[PDB]
Amino acid sequence: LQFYRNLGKSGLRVSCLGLGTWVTFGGQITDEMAEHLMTLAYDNGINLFDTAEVYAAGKAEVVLGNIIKKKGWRRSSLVITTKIFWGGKAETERGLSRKHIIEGLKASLERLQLEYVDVVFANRPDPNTPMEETVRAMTHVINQGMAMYWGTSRWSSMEIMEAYSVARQFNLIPPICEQAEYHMFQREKVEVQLPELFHKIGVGAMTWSPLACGIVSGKYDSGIPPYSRASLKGYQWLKDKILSEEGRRQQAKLKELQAIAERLGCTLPQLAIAWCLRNEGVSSVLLGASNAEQLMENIGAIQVLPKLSSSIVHEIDSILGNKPYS
Amino acid sequence: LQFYRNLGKSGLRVSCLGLGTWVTFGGQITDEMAEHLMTLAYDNGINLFDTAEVYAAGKAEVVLGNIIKKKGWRRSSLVITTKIFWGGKAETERGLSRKHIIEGLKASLERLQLEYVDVVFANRPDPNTPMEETVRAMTHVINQGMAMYWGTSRWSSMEIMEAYSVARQFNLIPPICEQAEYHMFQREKVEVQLPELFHKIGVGAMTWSPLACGIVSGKYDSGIPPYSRASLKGYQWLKDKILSEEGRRQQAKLKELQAIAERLGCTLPQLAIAWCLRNEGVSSVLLGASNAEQLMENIGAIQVLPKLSSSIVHEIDSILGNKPYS
Amino acid sequence: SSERVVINISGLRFETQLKTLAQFPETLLGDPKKRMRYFDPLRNEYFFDRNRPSFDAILYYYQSGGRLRRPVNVPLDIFSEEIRFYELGEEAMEMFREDEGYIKEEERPLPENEFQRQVWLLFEYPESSGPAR
Amino acid sequence: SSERVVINISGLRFETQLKTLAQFPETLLGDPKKRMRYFDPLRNEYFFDRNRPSFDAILYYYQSGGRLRRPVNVPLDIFSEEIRFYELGEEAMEMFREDEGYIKEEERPLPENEFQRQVWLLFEYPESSGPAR
Numbered sequence: 027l028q029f030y031r032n033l034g035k036s037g038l039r040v041s042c043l044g045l046g047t048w049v050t051f052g053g054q055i056t057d058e059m060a061e062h063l064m065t066l067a068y069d070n071g072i073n074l075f076d077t078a079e080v081y082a083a084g085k086a087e088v089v090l091g092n093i094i095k096k097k098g099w100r101r102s103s104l105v106i107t108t109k110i111f112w113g114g115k116a117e118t119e120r121g122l123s124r125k126h127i128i129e130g131l132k133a134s135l136e137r138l139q140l141e142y143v144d145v146v147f148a149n150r151p152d153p154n155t156p157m158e159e160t161v162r163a164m165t166h167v168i169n170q171g172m173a174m175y176w177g178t179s180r181w182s183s184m185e186i187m188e189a190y191s192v193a194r195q196f197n198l199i200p201p202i203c204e205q206a207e208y209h210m211f212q213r214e215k216v217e218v219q220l221p222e223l224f225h226k227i228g229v230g231a232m233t234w235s236p237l238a239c240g241i242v243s244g245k246y247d248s249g250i251p252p253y254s255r256a257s258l259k260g261y262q263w264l265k266d267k268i269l270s271e272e273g274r275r276q277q278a279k280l281k282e283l284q285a286i287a288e289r290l291g292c293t294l295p296q297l298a299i300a301w302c303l304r305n306e307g308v309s310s311v312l313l314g315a316s317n318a319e320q321l322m323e324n325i326g327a328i329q330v331l332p333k334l335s336s337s338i339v340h341e342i343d344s345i346l347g348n349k350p351y352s
Numbered sequence: 353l354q355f356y357r358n359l360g361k362s363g364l365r366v367s368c369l370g371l372g373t374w375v376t377f378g379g380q381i382t383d384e385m386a387e388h389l390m391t392l393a394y395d396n397g398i399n400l401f402d403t404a405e406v407y408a409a410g411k412a413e414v415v416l417g418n419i420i421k422k423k424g425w426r427r428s429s430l431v432i433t434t435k436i437f438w439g440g441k442a443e444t445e446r447g448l449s450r451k452h453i454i455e456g457l458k459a460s461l462e463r464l465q466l467e468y469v470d471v472v473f474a475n476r477p478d479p480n481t482p483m484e485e486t487v488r489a490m491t492h493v494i495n496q497g498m499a500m501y502w503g504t505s506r507w508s509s510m511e512i513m514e515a516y517s518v519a520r521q522f523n524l525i526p527p528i529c530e531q532a533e534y535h536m537f538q539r540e541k542v543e544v545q546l547p548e549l550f551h552k553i554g555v556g557a558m559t560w561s562p563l564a565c566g567i568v569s570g571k572y573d574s575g576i577p578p579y580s581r582a583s584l585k586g587y588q589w590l591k592d593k594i595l596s597e598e599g600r601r602q603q604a605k606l607k608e609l610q611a612i613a614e615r616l617g618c619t620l621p622q623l624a625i626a627w628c629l630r631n632e633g634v635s636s637v638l639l640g641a642s643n644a645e646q647l648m649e650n651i652g653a654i655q656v657l658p659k660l661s662s663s664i665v666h667e668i669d670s671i672l673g674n675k676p677y678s
Numbered sequence: 679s680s681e682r683v684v685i686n687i688s689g690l691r692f693e694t695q696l697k698t699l700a701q702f703p704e705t706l707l708g709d710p711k712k713r714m715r716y717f718d719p720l721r722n723e724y725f726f727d728r729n730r731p732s733f734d735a736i737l738y739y740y741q742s743g744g745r746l747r748r749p750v751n752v753p754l755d756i757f758s759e760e761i762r763f764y765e766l767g768e769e770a771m772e773m774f775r776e777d778e779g780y781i782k783e784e785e786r787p788l789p790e791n792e793f794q795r796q797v798w799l800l801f802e803y804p805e806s807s808g809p810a811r
Numbered sequence: 812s813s814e815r816v817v818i819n820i821s822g823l824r825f826e827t828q829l830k831t832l833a834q835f836p837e838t839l840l841g842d843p844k845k846r847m848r849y850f851d852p853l854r855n856e857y858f859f860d861r862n863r864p865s866f867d868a869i870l871y872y873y874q875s876g877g878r879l880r881r882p883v884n885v886p887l888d889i890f891s892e893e894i895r896f897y898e899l900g901e902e903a904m905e906m907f908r909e910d911e912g913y914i915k916e917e918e919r920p921l922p923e924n925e926f927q928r929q930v931w932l933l934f935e936y937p938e939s940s941g942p943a944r
């Protein structure tokens with residue numbers, strides 16, 4: 027019901043929906059479109075935009091950065107995030123070492139033409155770097171005014187808790203958010219492992235791929251449409267997924283969900299996105315969109331949210347048959 | 353008796369009277385006047401000037417900032433303060449999150465054309481932001497040289513103590529002052545809750561609206577004068593107050609106080625302001641003034657202060673009938 | 679896990695491994711949901727405003743794998759309360775008592791039948807009636 | 812309140828909730844004005860340069876809601892001083908003594924009348940006069 031919410035228990039307020047730039051910005055769509063998407067989203071109250079040093083080899087940041095500069099939006103009205111792991115072909119250009127966090131964030135900031143990001147993320151865990159080093163580097167970039175907060179992407183609860191304890195041990199800053207994959211076919215981490223962390227140390231979840239890259243949209247009920255992500259050069263692996271035996275099973279379950287959608291008077295994408303927001307532990311869902319129509323439809327997920335009653339939720343769980351055991 | 357005093361137990365020395373800019377600067381008065389008021393005050397030893405990001409949508413800071421630049425006063429001879437909470441229409445432009453404290457203070461500094469303020473305040477408590485985050489942000493702006501000290505406005509003692517303990521816990525900087533409303537008709541917080549804090553953790557009070565926006569001046573004994581704050585567009589609520597049943601009761605009590613004023617050989621505004629300074633826990637009183645006459649009269653409150661004997665104070669308490677129970 | 683847990687007993691600091699606590703999961707400390715209430719996220723510790731001396735025995739009970747010995751310096755009534763508090767369970771409690779020299783009296787068989795009860799009560803309990811006396 | 816209070820007894824750190832202390836407000840620790848003197852604003856703690864062992868009992872007295880047991884390791888004279896110090900009051904003191912095996916002797920009735928006193932003193936106190944002896 028509330029459009030805006032705290033990112034975890036931090037004081038940062040984000041819209042429950044954000045717009046990501048993976049695949050699209052500087053890649054699949056034309057910057058004219060990208061501007062259109064952001065403009066559209068910003069005008070609708072969405073204040074969260076997520077990107078990464080790895081998207082389109084840095085061009086996603088360049089495009090996102092240009093739009094913000096061209097539109098003149100007040101920096102204080104935006105929550106920009108960037109995620110760092112793979113920053114180069116060189117050995118020292120990847121990971122969460124102090125060297126790569128500082129250099130990677132600095133280069134993203136340059137591409138974004140921004141003084142700082144609101145949240146910088148560790149794009150994935152790094153077995154090769156002591157937690158202390160990572161936590162001190164993140165704390166460093168925050169103290170340098172290069173970021174307001176930091177978070178973890180793709181970490182386990184155990185690792186997130188390690189960052190938090192290491193932070194308390196050395197008087198550093200703990201992470202405030204984990205960017206986890208979450209959709210009807212990937213529920214385990216958010217619905218079993220993250221809640222404890224939310225209540226115990228305030229770490230919130232900012233989930234991605236709520237439509238499992240388009241799979242949950244229903245657009246693949248009959249095969250791979252032209253110009254769909256599954257058909258893009260480089261995204262075969264997605265294609266293999268859809269068409270796989272497991273893919274077929276998913277699509278069949280989606281047909282069952284459609285009836286739920288109609289009961290609730292919404293489209294499947296809207297239902298799927300609202301479903302991700304049914305639980306407090308999720309602070310925001312990062313959407314993906316290759317055109318304006320998709321974005322305008324997806325934003326409508328907010329109207330569905332109040333209708334997800336326990337009963338409906340149960341019904342879905344039955345259709346899905348994959349509710350994780352607590 | 354001493355014109356200057358320590359702000360709480362910090363080493364910052366302020367005059368017992370300061371000049372605020374709410375309603376007036378960039379709003380009700382003409383900058384020609386504003387310059388006149390500051391000039392007048394500065395020439396009289398007043399070194400404290402208070403403003404806020406919210407006053408006149410930032411114009412109060414612009415005007416105050418211009419005068420300081422035009423007069424060429426040595427920055428080291430001034431104690432400039434600014435208070436941050438509501439900095440914009442956007443969701444992320446209000447509150448005490450790290451994002452808004454840094455961005456809000458940075459924008460005020462830009463409007464003030466100043467490198468830093470001496471004290472930055474939290475304009476009011478923020479339920480939506482962990483104390484730790486706020487205290488770390490305030491400590492951050494101080495370490496960045498954006499402020500010399502920080503304080504709380506409108507917080508409860510419980511919250512002020514929480515900031516202090518959080519500061520000790522993480523080796524951060526505790527607040528040194530609370531900006532509390534204080535006048536003959538609003539005595540409870542200063543005379544019952546703040547003293548403990550003053551003696552226990554050194555937090556001092558810097559009170560505002562010592563004339564309850566003009567109500568205590570006596571100027572409203574016969575109705576709402578023209579050009580009085582109560583008659584300004586946007587200040588109806590004040591008008592409703594004065595004319596209310598409670599307002600009438602106040603005005604009647606003011607007539608009783610006038611006799612005290614004459615006994616002490618001063619005007620009611622002078623008595624009211626000096627009364628605010630009778631107790632050590634109050635470091636300074638922030639005055640408001642829409643013209644030079646008012647300021648020249650109000651400054652005379654300092655001559656009254658030595659005459660507030662216990663007996664007089666008792667007499668007033670009787671007239672007021674609102675002395676809070678300790 | 680070997681992730682370390684800090685339990686602050688009225689200022690006295692205790693540390694153990696999470697797997698040491700997880701050993702007994704019916705207990706307050708062994709159950710995430712039950713101890714959640716006592717967690718201080720600012721200091722990364724669980725805080726209990728409780729009697730200090732009793733604790734080692736309580737912690738040692740986990741480290742030892744079951745040994746619940748009352749400290750010599752702690753009154754039996756205070757310790758047993760602490761045991762109750764930390765929810766060590768009825769088994770530990772009984773063993774503790776037994777070792778403490780308290781023998782369960784079990785229960786006394788009851789007649790059920792109204793008459794026998796009526797009679798049996800004044801032939802074995804002078805307490806039961808003034809007449810029984 | 813649950814705001815946390817740290818009491819440092821000669822280096823030994825104790826913590827409790829302010830509402831645990833507020834429970835008894837006539838006491839040193841329970842009265843803001845009385846304990847103010849011992850507050851260290853640099854460390855956010857009240858410091859007492861006092862005997863260490865005695866304290867738990869003193870703190871437990873607040874946590875328990877009234878139980879004042881002398882630790883086995885602490886001499887009765889040192890503990891009673893500590894009790895006096897922390898101003899636990901005459902009630903707690905008496906109960907403590909009683910439980911400690913000291914029975915109040917109350918007071919002895921007095922004659923008032925000069926003569927009886929004069930006489931009664933040498934008939935029941937050999938102490939009273941060399942003649943009484």
Ligand SMILES: NC(=O)c1ccc[n+]([C@@H]2O[C@H](COP(=O)([O-])OP(=O)(O)OC[C@H]3O[C@@H](n4cnc5c(N)ncnc54)[C@H](OP(=O)(O)O)[C@@H]3O)[C@@H](O)[C@H]2O)c1
Pocket residue numbers: 045046047048049050076077109149179180205206233234235236237238239240241243245253254255256295312313314315316317319320321323324
């Ligand atoms: N933390 C991490 O490691 C991580 C990893 C991956 C992504 N992310 C973040 O999460 C964001 C969102 O992820 P995502 O792009 O995978 O999200 P998604 O919501 O799962 O998929 C969005 C894509 O599905 C299609 N789509 C969306 N709405 C549709 C609609 N109404 N009808 C039909 N098709 C629709 C579009 O693809 P087509 O139109 O091309 O078919 C669109 O590009 C990213 O941009 C990024 O910011 C983070």
Ligand SMILES: NC(=O)c1ccc[n+]([C@@H]2O[C@H](COP(=O)([O-])OP(=O)(O)OC[C@H]3O[C@@H](n4cnc5c(N)ncnc54)[C@H](OP(=O)(O)O)[C@@H]3O)[C@@H](O)[C@H]2O)c1
Pocket residue numbers: 371372373374375376402403435475505506531532559560561562563564565566567569571579580581582621638639640641642643645646647649650
């Ligand atoms: N911390 C906070 O949240 C907070 C909140 C409010 C204010 N403040 C601070 O406190 C400062 C002072 O507050 P305030 O303006 O309400 O103060 P005040 O002393 O209660 O009222 C000053 C106003 O009363 C009138 N006045 C003053 N002296 C007079 C005199 N001798 N004769 C007749 N009228 C006289 C003037 O209004 P007219 O001439 O227009 O009638 C003047 O603008 C502010 O400027 C601000 O810096 C802080």
